[PDB]
């Protein structure tokens, strides 16, 4: 449905999460297409 982790060491979109966190967020996944977006 959305972009999470699925399996412990699967997709691992983490890269985005990190980026977002630095700014000051608590989101960071792949959207519809597969682009890095952040969340609150």
Swiss-Prot record:
It comes from the Eukaryota. It is found in: Secreted. Disulfide bonds join 3-30, 16-36, 20-38. Belongs to the invertebrate defensin family. Type 1 subfamily. Responsible for the anti Gram-positive activity of immune hemolymph of P.terraenovae. This is Phormicin.
């Amino acid at each position: 449905a959305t972009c999470d982790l699925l399996s412990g060491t699967g997709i691992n979109h983490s890269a985005c999460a990190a980026h977002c966190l630095l700014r000051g967020n608590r989101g960071g996944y792949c959207n519809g297409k597969g682009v890095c977006v952040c969340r609150n």
